[PDB]
Design a protein around this ligand. Structure first.
Ligand SMILES: [Cu+2]
Ligand SMILES: [Cu+2]
Lengths: 620, 620
């Protein structure tokens, strides 16, 4: 009976029924987004009322709507018509991506471009990409997708090995018309194939790898109740799933002695943008907002035991809605398991004669998603010592282009004539903090060097300083690896036995942030990506760092708008938004299929406990 | 057979015999250091000539000597008398450490200080620490150790919980004289115990941890031949061990098709310093050069199966010399095993319909050492994809002091009246590079942001630049996390199929470097720690960033002196010295025994291969 339980197939069917009966789901309507709403602040009087938020698109050109329904009472709470030219277009529908290639196939301009290159239209695949907002005034209020071509020689061929450069088209997916076809010139289409399962490319497979058996004879140490409530080594939390954000962690708490202490109320990856840095007009508009425009949860893979998740695995099979309101289960879309994590603590003391060693372990909650050529893994980790960590694993096939004769300052060569445009993968982790409760504050901590002189005669001293972020106007921070900068979230009203506010310290990897020019469209639409840490006052309607309707929005939505309210964040209900990502200059080793690369962050207790919280761990 | 084989008990006994025969090892002599020398460059010597280098101390006060012997020919190659006041004292002898507490127990000044604090001398343990170089003229040319007191209430009590602040003594361990006893005032001695095995403190042990079984039914995938030659998933290398550096990796190479391609000739942690940042006269001289002053290898722990190393483990038991030249085995001092490392590569392609997933693995070579209250683990990893990584794991018990009543800017409070002075753990990895051979060069690579305008009208473009370090004077570099700075080691004479020099990219964690004032004794003695990367031209006698004799040695040797030669490093036999470490502001969670914290670095192939090197990994 938990308010955080996963949505059932029936609940989705109920939403569909409610919408249909209300006359909001006619033949031309499509569900672009559907997700359950989290309980509002308080809920003292559990008025069990499951509500769902829905974005309804209209393939007839009619205005879309944002609808909130109660499946508990079978009613429509609200239905507001949207003006997309102002607030943004709805997420792209899976069915719209498909129309791009089909439409271009009958367009004379597109056919002429292919004919000049001697490419069989039946062999040309088109990657349907988001459009963004640039200089095309005629696109305002219109639902546009831009297409890039790749040649697939046969059904099992990897089209990514054969990009068709110098060609790009724009399509209005509603009116179903090709608005523009741009041909800047012919580029040779890379000839080598990139079929990583072809013996001629892989060569003889290795026979040197001996098996590694990972098993748990007595089962896992974690328990799963209520379908998604996890309890493991003092940790307590609920594993949620949203079609937009994917796996979402709720009510992360730690059992300290006789009481369950909250740490984080809600943790999620609220946005993930992939901006490309190739100035060619063929791709200079390319920016993927995987979470906001595509909805990462929708493309979560069904994970295979022994392949994707090894060991004693417990799966969750979340249900999402299709474009018509029908429930669709993502079988084994979420993996949950614990794993050994080496030494936790060790000391061999000469004086006491006591030799002490203890092993560490971590709870893993993950899912993997595939969008076009991209495949990303999202992993959340909980450690015995109270550490919380997130890790993104990037793999898949690199997005390609032709490699210009004479070289390039924005593209790397992967194979003869095959290029890989430079780009970044930037994430935003939204952490609704709850350190021992909702009264929290954030301090920026920097190492402080000291000068040799009075009070420091030997010049060996060093210290640190903490600065409280009191208002949102001063809560947009940047990293400073040189000074070991971190951010501490504490509760000024909850102190440890040493009379110090309890807290958790966020450790960033300090990777580069958004590189685009400050005046670019992407810098405006993905402003969150330009700074490492943002702190806002909690608000029900502030869910994503990029706003609710990211697709083709002019910019400034999300964090920049929230921060502008300049609210008090010193000892209040606050939310931390951490930006982190990878800057990718593709290497030859990333082709034909990319070995995993990673990025993330972690938070460690900082005076949260009265002493080490793992003294009760037994000897293994 | 192999000139890179581990030293045998017989070789050590032979060195002892050769030294004795030469009249260099009488009863007053002690072996402060003994290690096998790596073979010289080029196939000079026909067969293999095994040579050992020894530092010989004299307990009567006579000048020590540095000697090189040929165990093969039974001859002394060179023997030079050392002027320690100039070039440095020899490493501390394990036998000198116990001298301190013993001598102080009968010193009137020390006894009076203890009586003023109402402490029973029989219960006062003394931590004998390296002295460094400061303003004490009488210490020049003498072997000094400085002692700090801790109370041990009973046999199995953790003395670290009871520091005796305001007191420190200096001792000449050769003449066995207490040179000075400094008492700055009585501080309350923390009363709470820190016994982590006491149920009173641990509380009932957890019974919630279910077993995790990791086994290999068909045995490990790596082979060990010649006692220390490893072959694993295309990797080839020799695992060496030196009493000073600990585990050293030799001839790291990768089998690419029909060629064994070298990558790194020698990899080791050439120095490790732990500088303290508390300006109190009681500890302002505290700087542990664990590698250079103590010799970390001799303190390597015997690792227990199922506790320290889990899974199918293969052990090496290196042999070192004791103070008299007798061989001593460190049973199971080195652990070797392979472990699963999640997903290696994955992609589910819509167009081809092919779903591909491969798992990763890594080879682990490690050892753990204990020096006083510190316990550090050194781990080297080799990955299927060609990545090489190092990781240091810090644990043990934090060094304590009293926590001043009025607070402190250089000490954190762990318990009532118990403090933990701020400090750093800084390592120097010496990487004698051999990317496809010895003709190498290093380039510093920075991300390059571009301004919106002609050629970049949308302001989305970004690039990078590479600067070749051509001479040693230009090869002392600092990190720049903000610009994603990395360093690439390439071979300008060996190109991949795309006509680009093959290389490897070094990725640093970009943690803060040495914080001490540049004019401090420690900034001069640990000069290498003030910069992130140094590149030198290979030289037989340039082994450590701090020189051969670190104990009580001022600046003048090491990296700063090597770089002065300003040698050509553009396409030559070069060595990369990477500084990396942790800055520790102790938390309450670090008490009474510290949970592991880590730091390290890694190198990934950068155009070294012609495509991904893991296409031949099976699905299994
Ligand atoms: Cu990428
Ligand atoms: Cu430390």
């Amino acid at each position: 009976a938990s308010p955080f339980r996963l949505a059932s197939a029936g609940e989705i069917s109920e939403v569909q029924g409610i919408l249909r009966t209300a006359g909001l789901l006619g033949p031309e309507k499509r569900i672009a987004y559907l997700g359950v709403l989290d309980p509002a602040r308080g809920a003292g009087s559990e008025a069990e009322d499951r509500r769902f938020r829905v974005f309804i698109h209209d393939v007839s050109g009619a205005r879309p709507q944002e609808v909130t329904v109660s499946v508990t009472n079978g009613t429509v709470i609200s239905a507001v018509e949207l003006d997309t030219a102002a607030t943004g277009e709805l997420p792209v529908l899976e069915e719209e991506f498909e129309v791009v290639e089909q439409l271009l196939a009958t367009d004379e301009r597109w056919l002429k471009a292919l004919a000049a290159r001697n490419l069989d239209v039946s062999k040309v695949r088109v990657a349907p990409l988001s459009a963004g907002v640039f200089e095309y005034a005629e696109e305002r209020g219109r639902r546009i997708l831009r297409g890039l071509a790749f040649v697939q020689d046969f059904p099992e061929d990897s089209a990514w090995a054969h990009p068709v450069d110098g060609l790009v088209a724009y399509v209005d997916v509603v009116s179903k018309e090709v608005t523009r076809v741009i041909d800047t010139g012919v580029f040779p289409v890379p000839a080598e194939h990139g079929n990583y399962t072809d013996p001629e490319l892989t060569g003889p497979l290795r026979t040197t790898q001996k098996p590694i058996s990972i098993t748990q004879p007595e089962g896992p140490s974690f328990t799963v109740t209520g379908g998604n409530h996890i309890e493991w080594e003092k940790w307590s939390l609920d594993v949620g799933f949203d079609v937009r954000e994917g796996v979402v962690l709720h009510n992360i708490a730690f059992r300290d002695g006789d009481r369950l202490r909250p740490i984080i109320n809600r943790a999620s990856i609220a946005e993930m943008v992939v901006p490309y840095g190739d100035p060619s007009p063929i791709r200079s508009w390319q920016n993927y907002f995987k979470t906001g425009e595509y909805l990462v949860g929708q493309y979560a893979n069904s994970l295979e035991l022994g392949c994707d998740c090894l060991g004693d695995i417990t799966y969750l099979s979340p249900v999402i809605s299709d474009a018509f309101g029908n429930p669709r289960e993502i079988r084994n879309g979420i993996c949950m398991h614990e794993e050994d994590w080496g030494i936790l603590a060790k000391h061999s003391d000469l004086w006491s004669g006591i030799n002490y060693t203890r092993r560490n372990r971590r709870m893993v909650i993950s899912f993997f998603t595939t969008i076009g050529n991209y495949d990303y893994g999202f992993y959340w980790y909980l450690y015995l010592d109270g550490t919380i960590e997130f890790e993104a694993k990037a793999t898949g096939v690199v997005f390609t282009s032709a490699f210009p004769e004479g070289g390039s300052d924005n593209i790397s060569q992967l194979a003869p004539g095959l290029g890989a445009p430079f780009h970044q993968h930037i994430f935003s982790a939204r952490l609704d903090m709850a350190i021992d409760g909702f009264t929290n504050r954030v301090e920026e901590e920097d190492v402080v060097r000291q000068t040799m002189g009075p009070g420091n005669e030997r010049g060996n001293a060093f210290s640190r300083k903490r600065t409280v972020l009191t208002r949102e106007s001063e809560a947009v921070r940047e990293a400073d690896a040189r000074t070991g900068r971190t951010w501490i979230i504490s509760n000024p009203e909850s102190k440890n036995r040493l009379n110090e506010p309890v807290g958790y310290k966020l450790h960033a990897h300090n990777q580069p942030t958004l590189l685009a020019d400050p005046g670019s469209s992407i810098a405006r639409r993905a402003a969150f990506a330009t700074k490492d840490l943002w702190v806002t006052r909690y608000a029900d309607d502030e869910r994503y760092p990029t706003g609710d309707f990211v697709n083709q929005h002019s910019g400034g939505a999300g964090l920049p708008s929230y921060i502008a309210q300049d609210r008090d964040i010193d000892g209040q209900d606050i939310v931390v938004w951490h930006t982190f990502g990878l800057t990718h200059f593709p290497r030859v080793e990333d082709w034909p299929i990319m070995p995993v690369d990673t990025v993330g962050f972690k938070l460690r207790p900082e005076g949260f406990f009265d002493r080490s919280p793992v003294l009760d761990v037994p000897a293994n």
